[PDB]
Each structure stands twice: as structure tokens, then as C-alpha cells.
Amino acid sequence: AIAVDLTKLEEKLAPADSFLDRHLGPGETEQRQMLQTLGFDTLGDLIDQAVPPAIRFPRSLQLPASQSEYGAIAQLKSIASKNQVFRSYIGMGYYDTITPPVIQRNILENPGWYTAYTPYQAEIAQGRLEALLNFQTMVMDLTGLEIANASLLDEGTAAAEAMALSYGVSKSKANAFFVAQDCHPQTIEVIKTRANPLGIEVIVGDHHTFSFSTSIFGALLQYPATDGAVYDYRSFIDKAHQHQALVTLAADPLSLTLLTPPGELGADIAVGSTQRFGIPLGYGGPHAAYFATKAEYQRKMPGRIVGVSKDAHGNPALRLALQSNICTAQVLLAVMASMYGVYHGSTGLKNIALRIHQLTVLLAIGLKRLNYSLNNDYFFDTLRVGVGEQSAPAILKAAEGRGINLRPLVPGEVGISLDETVTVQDLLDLWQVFAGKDNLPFTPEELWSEVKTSFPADLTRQSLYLQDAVFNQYHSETELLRYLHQLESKDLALNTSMIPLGSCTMKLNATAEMMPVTWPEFGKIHPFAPAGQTEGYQILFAQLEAWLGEITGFDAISLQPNAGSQGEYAGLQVIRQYHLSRGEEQRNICLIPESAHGTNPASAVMCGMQVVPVKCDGEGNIDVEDLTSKAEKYGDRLAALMVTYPSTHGVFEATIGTICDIVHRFGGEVYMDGANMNAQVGLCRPADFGADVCHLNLHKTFCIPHGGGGPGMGPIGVKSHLQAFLPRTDQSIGMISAAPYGSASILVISWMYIAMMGPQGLTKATEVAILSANYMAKRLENYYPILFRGNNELVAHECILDLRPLKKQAAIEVEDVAKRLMDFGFHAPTVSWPVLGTMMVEPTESESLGELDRFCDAMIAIYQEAQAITHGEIDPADNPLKNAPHTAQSLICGEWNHPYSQEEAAYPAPWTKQFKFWPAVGRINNTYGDRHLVCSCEGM
Amino acid sequence: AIAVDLTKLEEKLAPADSFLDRHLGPGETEQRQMLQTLGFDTLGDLIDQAVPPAIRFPRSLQLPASQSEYGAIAQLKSIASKNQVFRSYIGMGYYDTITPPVIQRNILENPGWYTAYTPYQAEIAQGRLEALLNFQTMVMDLTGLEIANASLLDEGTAAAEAMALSYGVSKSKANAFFVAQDCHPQTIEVIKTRANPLGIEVIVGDHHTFSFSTSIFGALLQYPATDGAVYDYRSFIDKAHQHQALVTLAADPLSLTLLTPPGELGADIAVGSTQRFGIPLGYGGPHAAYFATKAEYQRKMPGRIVGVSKDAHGNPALRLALQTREQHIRRDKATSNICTAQVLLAVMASMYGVYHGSTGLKNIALRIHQLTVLLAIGLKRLNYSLNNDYFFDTLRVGVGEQSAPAILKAAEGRGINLRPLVPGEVGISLDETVTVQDLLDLWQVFAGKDNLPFTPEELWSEVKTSFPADLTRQSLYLQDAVFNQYHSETELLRYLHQLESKDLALNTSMIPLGSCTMKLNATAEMMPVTWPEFGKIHPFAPAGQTEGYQILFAQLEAWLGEITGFDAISLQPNAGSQGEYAGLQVIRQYHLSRGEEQRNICLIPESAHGTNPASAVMCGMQVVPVKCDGEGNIDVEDLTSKAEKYGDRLAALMVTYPSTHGVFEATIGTICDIVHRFGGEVYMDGANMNAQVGLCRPADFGADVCHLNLHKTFCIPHGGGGPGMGPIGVKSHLQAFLPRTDQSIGMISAAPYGSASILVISWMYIAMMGPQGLTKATEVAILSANYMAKRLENYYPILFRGNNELVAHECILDLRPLKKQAAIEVEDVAKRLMDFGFHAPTVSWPVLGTMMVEPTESESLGELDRFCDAMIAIYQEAQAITHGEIDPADNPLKNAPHTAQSLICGEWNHPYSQEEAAYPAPWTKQFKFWPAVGRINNTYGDRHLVCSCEGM
């Protein structure tokens, strides 16, 4: 009433700063210029030709009117204020930790570190590649195992990956996987959820009493246990090996500064979280999980691995080596965890752990004086305290009164996990809470004389860790600042130039969106804090669920899955559970078009489905006749079709509705991979044209930053008939991520984007993304054939450039073009996917016309360079394309013996003389790196 | 008791992360190595031999025990939470504003922008130089005037600089300066405080009724006025010109998007604050003030000015221009005492202009003006009297004596502050943050009820937002490409990144600038600056809303008092220059208070910072230099002679300790005794306090007053040339005269606590270091300086040493032999260091032909050694010239710095290789910092002064 009147009045005022105009690259003038090159007068008219009318969303999105950056921040701040920041000593896999301010400011809040994506182009990613090498080295050193990857999604899924690895190398008919009952309970549920569709039996029980009567292929043990107890696992491991099973330890990596590590205990695999290496609690994430194992299983390892190779000049250089459904991981958070190791060093890390342990021993001695029973013989940071059923509720409440959360274990027992933030003053609060009064029957300092903090020799670590120079040389703040800056300077990120990676949506990660991630009311909340303290998050989730529901047209949203791969997997699990609920167990066929992202069939197989490929036609589109024939053939067994819309070829197929009808006719569900949603928002809705479930990549379409290769979030939307089966936050599939809302803290980014854009702005973004892709295609089409065009000769949000003629004409490979683009100051687009020998270019709506033109001009110049080779005008082996990228040192030092000038090499376009980005290394030898796998700092 | 018990227990625990170990560069092993090189068994021995045992502080500093970064942040957050963030519509020269998040994150919270200092080495400072050029251009465009500088400290002091300029160019014998009574009241006080020691008569009155009967040399008018009124000042300006006076307008630069600008009105000078170009309120600062005037007054402009020149390759390049105006060359004859200014905030303000452009800026002002007109119409419906005929953002509302307190109280109940004007009148200033919902609150507060006799939208059809033709601006502004090209966030992100990449700051390598103390600006120290509880408070908010700041100030006053030994501390002065000036003002007031008005002689040793004699002249004192002896020390005999001669007239001695020569003189106590014997006060320049903290205290060895540079010794970042804070400590007998926060000197800074928000940085430093840590920092600073001197002494003579052949926290390297032997100039060495990846140390000050090197305690041994190795390599390059082994005119020293383009493009015709040019040391092959331009032609730039984007 009064509010409606204010909105009228506000609309009369001079126009205010609109976030849409900061998010978009091309303004109205630039848009009109682009449209004219395309032969359209208006964007609306172009979009009417791009999007098939039958699937066009016929109205505006029902979303809140856009807010300014200032207003949206203020609104979210009021929501955030409803959360309460307690001292949580809940433990269970998440422990408060101190992020060194220098790392918070210069990595987590630095777009130079969070805006690039996976280091596909290694020569311009040596900085984050080195940080990841440090991460691998830290994990190898602490676990005592031979190889480690460049991070997994969270502790529980890493453990599930360990189960899968163990299953693969098993040669027995053993179908059971033993999980110790004192693993973290969310880990157990994630494992059970992954085991279900594969028919794997999960046996959960006390490791002490496991009989080894039932054949197992693997076992998972928690170290220290979830209730805190530190056990000697050697005997169990020995017995498991006698029964041909691999043993995985889920091991707290901070505890491994003190405790005998998994490698020395005989464990085959180690997993865990690196969250307490200075990564915010985040109400669940994002945190990098680790995965370490024996070198003999290196070809079986999940995820990405950084390896040391050499460049064209013989110098050391890093690359992803040996290239599960996992794609996007947790790179940014692995960088933070490794920098925590670099800044603290081995001595510093051990002192942090020793202090935590000393405080926990002191805590225990005082609780004993208060006549409580202490169950753990040995512990790192976590006590199991027997208080009796009568006292447990009052203690937990008194604790809450002081803003402290403890862990309820079983009736009459309370768990307490201390951490890096804990002070002697916190200890006093704990004693007084347990005493029920403030005057204690002891003095704090009096207890120190009793403090015995050693472990038995069988559990006392002697081996060293983090001995490489990198962990010793950068302990002043100034030193670390400079190290970070040097690594950052090697990497080409979005603060330098457009990174037009097809299938990745490298759009603006706006400062206003990123800001709230590091507000303590979002970042400093334990994922299992009582609901009464997380009402701000509850509001955030409810809003995001409603908004993503409206965008997709689905009736329910699960925010849990913490990657695109996880969303696909969750979606297929929900479909599987649906068929089971109808008494249709035999439905296990998953139809997948050959063009699909590789995550799709990997996810299907993980879900116990049998993949049946569906041909794509001569235009690159889904072959409807073939789909119909396969659907008919597998009618009784059809579980699902997984479809990407628009296709991985960047095309709006007009047949999508018909395709869904066919699948439904034969009893299947339709799953839509939502990676290409940047061509859809406001223009079509998956639920409307026949999808039953989809996932969204929030790190593509909805602005979560690419993080150098992570983090992401992959929420799913489902129709009502599937809602009952959604992951838990009688019928649920269980848990897909370790935390109920996955990496909850980064969800604020997509909330901010939607709040600041509003329904018209979100739709305009989609439209401009399509305009810019089509503009680039039109500019380049006479130089590089555009491989797949939709109806009306338009593409969607990306286009595929055919580089195969250059190979025929000039013996030039796509890799040569990709490296030569570095000399022009550009990261290459997506290379050789989905079609070998091509590039897929996706500019997004956030890049200016000037930037688009520079990229096209670079490609045209490279076209002319290839023509020169074709026409014999320059040596076919010694030319800028074959020798790219050109380092400054290669141009300045030694003799210059090439048939082109140093200026032609380094400044091939005018903009490079205004600002030059220097490739840090020459072209990296890929085959050499895979042949001689070196994955730690020892090799560099 | 219980805390005592806990402290005891905590000491038993494994060592936690100590901030001291992050702040220091050299650890214990590195320190032992450096001591071995120096021939000392312990650091204690070195310090006992460096510091005269007589002035030595005989106990530990009484300061709180060190806290971790985590604990100190928590403690300050608790303090900050006591402040209340209101919607302040108080105005008076400070208005809430929206800092674009992209600028907050990538400039204000980016050490790449805030760690370097004044762009003395222009070739490695083109980024901030360009941002300053944009600032000047924005100011010129908006004011309609011909030249503008690269910032002043605040609005009131800028107006005082305008008074000084007007006095300096006056054709008459006029001694009076007219100040309109509707200038901001703090501006009036700053002006009066500056006029007092110069004997200038300040007339404060209604500009409408000024008779011009008393001759004036200048007039200051406020536009719009402090109460909001917009006046047509043309007639006044014409009359002032008829009477041979200059007119300065203190003009709100946002309002100039709509209002006819000073230049077009005929004004000679414009000053103001650029705070509302996206700079946090900051409880007073820091904000860059602007100063614009006519080209014909170039040589009299205060402060720094960026000018477009060209480099060795004929390419456009920027540099500081007309430097003989400034204190470091000209000293007592400088145009002002200003040194450190507000560069970081000028960068932010110009980026606000770049991001919003002319259209965006105008829309911000239009919307503010529309909201204010709407507010006005509503208040009239409620039967209130509205006094301003025309206004931009500020209303003067007649409410009556009886209602005014209740309205103010009701506003406070909704978390709103208004401005008390006079009894029965209330001021309201709207700003960029204001929404129609805020309007509704204001109307309901004035209505005394929630249901209004009108609806908001209904009022719109009555809104006239235009001004009379004679006040309506027609001229364009910000038409240069730079203000149009970077409006997407991604574009601005990239522009900022490209500029930042051109500049060598502390995230690259050590910048060992003597007299500057380029130590760690720790992230934890910087973090609280941008907490809203510090950044979003209006400086004239009611005391009940600022208890967190009260606590911060009390603690800082106590701690700096303990460090200096002084009885009272003033946190007001907002630069070292202001601290000196405030100190001299208090000394002057003291002599007057004793009935000793004739004391106006200020003794100043020849080595002193140019700010010293400049400050003295501004304080109405006559400078008498005191000679330095053969060994560079103050000549006690000469001091005594002059003290005797000017006995009856001796006001002060200004002394820097340790000296600007980097030496601890053992005579400092005797020197103070002599000054006191002859009736003078002793002022100590505390810019070298990084050699003193915990080791000696100025008050203990004879100083009556000192200033500290928090941006040198206490970690406020150098900001590319600002901001700073220059608090003063005084003995009890001077306390009565301190600036207002019957006897006060008045106001030195426009805001009572100057740039209050940045004081949290120094609070954090002290809290995290503790007494032993602060003292260790001083000792390591001295160790590292002596280490570098020892390493370099056989190559470059150490010009001055103290007792036991030691230096203090810095040393002077004599490069004059290189000039004699090889015709190598100090600037040659400075540019060649760029090719080694280093910013030069301080060049040619205090001694021409030398370099003064100050590493600070924050730089590692490895880094100290690389710098020494660079200087040694350069020495060998000079020796090759000397021995005739290379063309004396064509060699790396003469041609430095070497851009990548100069090496890669075109034919290479030099008797040395490109590798020798770009990679003269092995670390450059690990990480190469590229100079963005070749050597800049200085004389060409001063000959053809171009100070806006049109030239570049």
C-alpha cells in the first residue's frame, strides 16, 4: 500500500547505478553495432529467431525487482545478522581455524586468484599449478603415502572415491566394504548412498570386533575417531591385507603432525579434509579434501594431478598429468590450504597441533577433577565425556548460554573438539559450564604439572614433513605477500582478458557477489550448528530455492550437491529411487547422446545404470529416429535419458519437447544437464519442455567464481513426483555431499547475482550472451568454418570453430593456435571438445565489444600466420605458431635464429604494446611429463 | 588473579603464532648472521653501542602484552561494536557515499595500490601517476579552472592554502581575509588558526552585507553554503576583483555536475573535498581535498602536481612537475609545508569518476537533488518554514525553539542524525545512500506521526528540480575517453590491474627509502579500516554514538604517551607537516601565555627536513639556521652562539633525532639544555622514531613537544603518497594549548581527530607487537641498516657515522666519487636499480649526490643481500666506464631503465647485450619486474606544463 506508492515515486527519479550495466560488457550502443553486423535491428528480434518458439518461455520471470549493489548488500546483511556465531566445539569433521589475514586478503579476496578456471593451458597457469604442487607435497608428506591428487570435493565423497578405487583393484568376488562405526556419521551416509546403486554391501561396526568372516574388498577407518579416540590400527590393517582388502584411513591432517601417519601404519589410501588448514567453516564448505595412495594405483586415482615436466627450453614446468565423474574440484581452497602450510611451516603446524592437544589434555584433567568420566584412552583434540543422562541436557544448555556448542553423542555423553581458536579463557568457560558454577575446585595453572601430552611410542610420529625449501622460506608476511604475488603474476585470469572457454561460462564474478562469502555470519558457522543459530542461512536457502525453482520451472530444489558431477549423480539417484518406488526395479538403461559431457555416462555408471549411446545426426543434432528405436528396444528397462540443452554443440534443437515425450512414452525420466543454462535463463525452462530433473552449475551460469578449477555448486531441480527422494538436509536417497547444504557459504554469490539482476536483467544477460557468441561466429566464419548452427543459421551462447583445415593446409594443430593466442594476451577457448581438432568459444555477456573484437582479431591474425605457412612464405617448423608461447627470456637471451622477428613474436597486435602479458614458460612437453610422473616439490 | 593464573598457564603451552615473527624480516638465525658480519657478539651489544647510554630508556615500555592477530582483531571488533552506525544527514562537509565494491576490493584493500610511496621514481609509478592525472582532470573539468594539484589534506586546510596563495600574490597592502559566515564552521576555525600567527585579520560575516570598507586580499565563499543555500556569487566576485582581492570558492564537487562552476562565476581558486566521490566518511578521513586555480598561479600552487612529459623514446610519460615549489628542495621558501598528502584517496575518487562517468555522476547528483526537493515539499505540507531559496542536497528547516529538540530526539530514535543549526532551526543533508524509504522516515519524524497528510508519489507533480539560468551549468565535464571507456566491472577491474602492474610496490621488493620507513603494512592492521563501525561514522555524530572511537583514542593516547614520554597526546594533525605546525603553534601560544610575545626566532639545523622551516615560517617565526660540524653533527658551539645572540627572542629549536644524517648524536641532551637556558622550547621532528621506540623517549631527553609519523614508524601505509597522521605529544606546560577535540590554538585539521579511521592501523600494530616486540622492531631496524652499511662501505663511502662507527636506522651512501670517476649521476644509479627490480632509496636528500638507505626491520636478509648485490653490480658497471671498458655515454647506467619494447623492437645498437640490460642479476630470471617507460625527460615536462588527460 505505502510500499507500492514508494516504488511509483522511486521510478520517477533520475536513473540510479544499475548492476546490470556493470555485469554486461556491451552497452546499448555496442549491442546495436553487433546486431547490425548480424543483420538484425534489435536483440529481441534476433532472440526470436535463435530460440525455438515452441519452447520459448511466454512471460517474465516471477522474481523480486532488481536491487542496487548497495541495497542488495544491505538486504543480505540483515539476513546474515540472523545467524549466530558460536564457539562450536562440535567437531565431526569441521573445526574452526584461523585463516591468516594475508591469505584471506590476497588469495580468497583477490580476483587474480579466483577468476581463472582449470589449468588447461599450463603455460599461463604455472602459479596455481605450483600452489597445487605444494598441496600435493603437503598431503604426501603428512600421510606418508606416495602420490596425492589436486583435491576432491569433501571428506565423505573422497572416502567414497576410496571405496570405488578399492572395488576396482579387487580381484575377488567380495562385495562388502567395511566402514568403522566411529567414522563421522555424514561420511557413513555418503558411503552408503554411493554403495546402494552398485549393490555394494556396507558393513558398519566396531573395528575392534570385526570378524573378517564376510569377504570385504576394502575397509574405512577414522583417525582419530569421530568421538576423538586414537587407536593403533596396525593389527586391523594386517588382518585386512590377509583378506585381500585395501584399507583407507580418513585421517585428520593436522593430527598427523603428531600421530604416526597412514603410510607408516600400512594403510593403502588416505583421505580427509584440509579445512582446518585455514579454510573457513563455511557452514559446510567449500574445503579441499585430500586423496593419497600408493604409486601402483596412480592410473586408478580420481581427479586431477599436477606433475613436473619440462618446457621447450629444458626448464622445469608444471602441467596436469595423466589426463569417477569428478570434473570441477576445490582448487582455490587447495591453494589456501597449501599456503597455510607454506606460512606456518612444519614447526608452526606442529606447534598449532601441540597447543590444541595440550589444551585438550588440560580440559580433560579438569573435567576429571569435576568427577566426569573420560572415555578416550588417547586423543588429539576431542574428548568423549560421560556426564549421565540427567546432566547432559543442562550442560549443553549452559554451554549454549555462553555461546558454545558441544556435540551430543549418545544420551549421557557429550563430545568436545578443541581447535586453533581455543584459548585458556575458553577452557575456563568449559570447566565452569561442566562444573555448574564459576568457582572451580582447582586452579588452571595447578593442572599443568599433571599434563602428560605424549602418545605411546606406537602412535608417536618420528618422520619429518614439509622439509622442502618452499615451506621454510616465506614466513614473514612480506615474504609470503611477495611469493603470492609472483605466483599470481604468472597466471592469466579474468583481471587480464576474456577467457572464452566453451562450456564454462567465464562471466563476471562481481565484487558485491563475493563480498558476503567472508562475512563471519556466513563463513564462521559450523555445518551442524543447531538450527536456532542458522536462521539467516534458512532464509537464504528458501529464497534461492524459490528463485531457482522459478528459473527452471521445477517444484523443488536441492542445494546440496557440491559440483555439476554431483548434481548429475544426485539427479540419477532420484530417478532410480523413483522407479524403485513404483516397483520397477528392472529400469536401469540410461540413454545418452554421443555429444554429452563425459561426466554424464560416468555418473550413470556410478548410479548402476547401463549406458546406451544415442546417435547424433549429420547436423550434429540428436537423431530422433535412433532415439525412438533405442527407447522402443529398451522400453521395459528404460530408466532415463540424459540430455544437454542447448546441445554440447551449442545448438537450440527444436526437437527437445518431442524427445522428452518419446522418453516418457517408454517409461523413462528425463534428466537435463544444465551446464548450458546461460543460453536459457528467462528464455526457456527445462521443466516446461519435458525435463523431470536438471542440475544447474552455479559456478557457470550464476557467478560462483571458477576458482582456478573449483569450487562449484550443482543444485538440482525436480518435478513434484521426485521430491520425496531428495538428499537429506523413509524415502530420501540419503546424502550426496558431506554437508547438508554442501558448500553453503558460496551460495550467497548466486543469491546476490539474482537479487541485483532481477527478472529483466537475468533475461537480458542470457540474450546478450547469445548476441556476443553469434557476433564472434559471424566475424570468424570466413576464416574458420562454424561447425554447427541451429535453425535460422544462429548459434546459442557458444560456437565451434573448425580448425581442422589448418592441419591439412599448414600442418598446424589446435594446440599451436592455443599457445599462439598466449602471445596475443589470450587464454585459449575450449580445445578439442566436444569435437577433436576444433575450438569452442563462449564469450558470455560480461565481455565488451572491444574485447570480443580483440579476440577475433587475434584469431584472424593467426589465420594469416597459418596461410603464410601454407603458401611456403615461412618455414613450416620454425614459425611463431610452432614456437609459441614466447617468453621474454627466450627473445632477449642468446642468439636469435628464427625467420621472424622478436617483435612479431611478442607484439603481434597493437594492444600488446599497451599492456603485455608475459607467458612464464615456453611450451610444455606433455608426453615427457606423463612418462616420468613427478608430483611433489622434490622434483622442482 | 584468575587472569594472572590463566596467563601463567598460557605461557606453559607450545608457542603460538607471534605477530612479531611475521612483522620482522630477519629471524634469529638471520640476525646472528648479520651480527657476525658486523663483528658484534649480540644484538644487545650493538644497540648499547649505537644509542647514547645517557638518553637510554631504563625500563620496559608499560604497554599491554602482545596479542595474536586473531586476538587483537577480536579485541578491536569488541571496541568497534560500541560505535553506532546512524543515517547521518548532518552535512557540514561530510556526506555518506557508496564506494563501488570493485574499488573497495581492488584499490583500498589491495596492497599493490597502498604500499608504495610518493612517486619519486616516475618510471615505476606510471599507474598511480595516471590515476592522479585523472584526478586533476576531474577537478579541472568540474571547477572550470585551468590547473589542479594531486590533492591536499582536507577542505579547511585547502581553504587555508588558498588564503596563503591569495596573500602571496596580493598587489595591495591589504591584511584582511574575508570568510563568509556560511562556510562550514570547522573551515572557519582552521582558517583563523592559520591566520593567527601571520597577523592576518579574518573577517567573518554575511557575504551579502560585506562593505569592502576594510581592505581585503582575498575572500572565501561556500558553494552551496553550509546551511544548504545556493547563491549567485558573481556580484560579490566582481566587487572583490574591483578591490584587488582573489575569491576562493569552497565548492562541493558533486554539486558542480548541476551548478555553474567557480571558473565560470569568475572565481580565482576552488577548493573542496572529494570525499563524496565514494570515500568512506571515516569519522573525519582520510579524504583527498582538491585545489584548483588559474595557470598564471602555477608556481605558487601548494603540493604535488602531475604533468605529462615524454620518455627517452619520445613516448608519453607522467612525472611530478615543478618540484622546486615543494619543501624537499625549497624548505623555508616552499609554497607550503605539505609533504605527504592524500594520494590513495585521490586515486579512489578519480576511479569513482572513471566508473560513473559524466552521465553517472550527474544522475547521482540529480537524484539527490530530486529527493531533497521532495523532502522539502513534504515538510512544507507539514507547515514547516523552509529558508533556502535554492539548494543542492541540504535544507534549512524552521521548526521553532520548542519543537527542535523533540524532532532531533525523534530522528535519533530511528537512527537518524540531523544538524542543529540555531535554536529552532534544523539542517538536513541528503546523499547518495538516500532512498524514498529514508524520505518517509524523515517526514514521519517531522510529522510526529506515521500517517501523513499526503502520499509520496502525489508530491512528484509539484517537483521543480531546475535552478535559475544563472546557476544552471551548461558546460560539459569528464568528456575524455578515460571517463567513458571503463563502465563495466570487468573493464574497470582490468584498467585497475593494468595501472597497478606498472607500479613497483611492497608486494614486489624492498623500497629502502631513507626518511620514509617502508615497513610492513600488515593485513590485520589494515582490515578494521573498512569495518562500517569505523568507516561509516560522520565526524560530527553525537558523542553517544562514538564510544568505540573514544576507547580507541584513549588507548592510543595512553600508548603513544608511554612511547614518547609525553604527558598529553593530540591525535588531530593529519600529516607530519601538520604535526610540526601544530607543535610550533603550541610553543607560540606558550610564549604568549608567559607574556613573552617577542619570542619568534626558530633555530633549525641545516640538515633538517624541508617541512621544518616551512612550518616555522607559517607559524610566524624567523628561521635561523644552525651549522652542522665536520662530521655532520649539530655544531654545539654554533648552536650556543646563536641561542645567546637571540636569547631574548628565542622561540624554539626544531631538531630531528636521530638526525636526517642517520646518526645518534650524544649531545642531544646538552643541546636541549642550552635551548631551555635561553628561554626556548624544543620541538622534535619524530619522523625517525623507528630508531627510538623502546630505546629512548623524546620527552625524557629534553623535547617539549614532538610529532610522530604514524605512516612511517607505526604502519599506516604509504598510499602512493598519503594518507598519513602526525599526532603530537607535549609536556604538561603545553597541554592547555592543544587543538580542540580560553586557551586552545583552535583547529589544525578540519575534523577533530583528523583521519580517524586509519588510526586503527597503529592501534593494531601496538596491540599485536607489545612492549618487547615494539622494541625488538627498533633494534632490528638498526641492525639491518648497519648491516647494509657494512656490506656497501667499501664501494660507496658511508657519509656519516655516530659513536662506535655505527649508524642508526638508515645510512647515507656517498655516490659523489662515482660522478667524479665515471660521470655517473645519482639518477643513473636510481634508474639502473629498476632493471634489477628495485625502487631506488631516497635520492639527493639531505645531501646532494648521495642516497639514503633505510631497510626497516620488516625486510629479510635475503632481500637486504639482493639490494646490496645490486648496488655492488652497479658499482662494477661504473668501474667499467671509469676504466674505459665501455662507451661513457652509451651503457646500461645511462640508458636505464630498459623497457621490454626497447629491447625487443627495432635494431639493437648498443655496446652491451639485451641480456645485460634486462637480466643483470640472477633473481631477475626468476621474476622480472618490467619498467613501463624509458627514462623520463624532466626539463621538458616543466617547460611545457600539461596537467590533464588531454595531453596524455
Side-chain angles (χ1 to χ4, degrees), chain B residues 100 209 339 345 390 443 449 474 551 610 662 665 766 793 845 947:
Chain B
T209 63
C339 187
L345 298 316
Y390 299 101
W443 282 327
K449 64 164 72 160
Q474 299 296 337
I551 293 171
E665 303 177 53
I766 292 162
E793 69 189 7
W845 187 88
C947 58

Side-chain angles (χ1 to χ4, degrees), chain A residues 539-551:
Chain A
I539 291 164
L540 183 86
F541 300 152
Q543 293 180 358
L544 202 50
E545 284 158 11
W547 303 342
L548 297 179
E550 167 68 4
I551 289 160

Side-chain angles (χ1 to χ4, degrees), chain B residues 267-346:
Chain B
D268 307 280
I269 302 172
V271 301
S273 179
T274 62
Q275 178 264 316
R276 76 197 304 186
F277 284 6
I279 318 298
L281 291 166
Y283 197 52
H287 316 128
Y290 75 81
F291 188 104
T293 189
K294 300 289 184 179
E296 65 192 4
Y297 304 132
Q298 273 164 49
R299 290 176 49 93
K300 292 303 188 75
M301 187 112 14
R304 290 184 278 265
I305 306 173
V306 176
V308 182
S309 192
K310 68 192 184 181
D311 76 354
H313 315 290
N315 300 132
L318 307 174
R319 57 177 279 278
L320 296 174
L322 300 188
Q323 300 184 241
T324 67
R325 292 166 305 106
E326 309 183 48
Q327 55 79 25
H328 65 85
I329 298 181
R330 205 75 204 270
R331 306 193 75 185
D332 49 312
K333 286 78 171 294
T335 53
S336 170
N337 65 342
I338 193 175
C339 187
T340 299
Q342 305 283 19
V343 167
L344 181 63
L345 298 316

Side-chain angles (χ1 to χ4, degrees), chain A residues 579-626:
Chain A
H579 293 307
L580 292 178
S581 79
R582 299 159 70 89
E584 295 263 342
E585 283 88 316
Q586 77 290 357
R587 292 186 179 271
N588 73 325
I589 295 291
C590 187
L591 301 174
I592 304 184
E594 283 146 24
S595 65
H597 205 259
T599 52
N600 292 180
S603 295
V605 171
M606 285 168 61
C607 206
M609 294 177 183
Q610 177 196 325
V611 176
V612 172
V614 180
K615 295 181 180 293
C616 298
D617 67 23
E619 296 196 300
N621 298 314
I622 301 186
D623 184 336
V624 174
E625 276 193 337
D626 187 46

Side-chain angles (χ1 to χ4, degrees), chain A residues 321-472:
Chain A
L322 316 180
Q323 299 175 235
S324 173
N325 63 345
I326 197 172
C327 186
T328 303
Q330 304 287 19
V331 170
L332 179 63
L333 298 315
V335 169
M336 291 181 63
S338 69
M339 293 301 177
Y340 182 97
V342 167
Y343 203 44
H344 287 297
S346 58
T347 296
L349 272 190
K350 184 177 176 163
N351 280 341
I352 287 158
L354 277 167
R355 182 169 185 108
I356 289 167
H357 180 61
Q358 290 165 340
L359 289 167
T360 311
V361 173
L362 279 159
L363 176 57
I365 296 170
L367 298 180
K368 290 212 189 183
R369 295 283 191 101
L370 297 168
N371 295 117
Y372 291 107
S373 61
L374 282 110
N375 284 249
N376 301 341
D377 292 343
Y378 297 98
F379 47 86
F380 167 46
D381 60 348
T382 301
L383 299 184
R384 177 171 193 127
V385 192
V387 302
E389 291 95 341
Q390 301 169 266
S391 299
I395 289 172
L396 288 176
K397 153 171 173 154
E400 281 195 16
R402 305 211 179 184
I404 294 168
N405 290 318
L406 303 180
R407 183 187 175 181
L409 272 173
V410 291
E413 293 186 351
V414 175
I416 309 172
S417 296
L418 302 186
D419 60 48
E420 186 183 4
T421 71
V422 173
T423 63
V424 290
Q425 287 84 9
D426 298 321
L427 237 52
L428 183 61
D429 277 326
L430 290 168
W431 282 327
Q432 293 173 331
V433 160
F434 276 79
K437 46 188 174 54
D438 292 350
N439 42 312
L440 301 173
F442 57 84
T443 31
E445 205 277 333
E446 158 190 356
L447 311 192
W448 183 254
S449 57
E450 306 189 34
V451 166
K452 126 77 173 36
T453 51
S454 58
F455 296 99
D458 66 347
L459 297 171
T460 297
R461 183 176 193 146
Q462 287 304 314
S463 60
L464 307 182
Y465 42 84
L466 276 59
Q467 296 300 292
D468 290 320
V470 70
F471 298 108
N472 298 290

Side-chain angles (χ1 to χ4, degrees), chain B residues 397-475:
Chain B
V397 186
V399 300
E401 286 105 345
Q402 293 176 92
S403 297
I407 289 167
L408 290 168
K409 185 186 201 298
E412 280 174 357
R414 303 199 184 199
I416 291 168
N417 292 316
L418 308 178
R419 187 191 176 177
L421 275 178
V422 287
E425 298 200 68
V426 166
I428 313 169
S429 294
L430 298 190
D431 59 49
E432 187 184 2
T433 71
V434 175
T435 62
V436 285
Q437 292 77 10
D438 296 324
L439 283 203
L440 186 67
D441 278 330
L442 290 169
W443 282 327
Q444 293 173 328
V445 160
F446 280 77
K449 64 164 72 160
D450 277 5
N451 23 34
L452 300 177
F454 54 82
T455 83
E457 202 277 302
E458 163 193 348
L459 301 183
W460 179 254
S461 63
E462 307 170 23
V463 165
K464 173 187 255 51
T465 38
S466 62
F467 297 97
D470 58 12
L471 293 179
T472 295
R473 181 176 191 144
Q474 299 296 337
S475 60

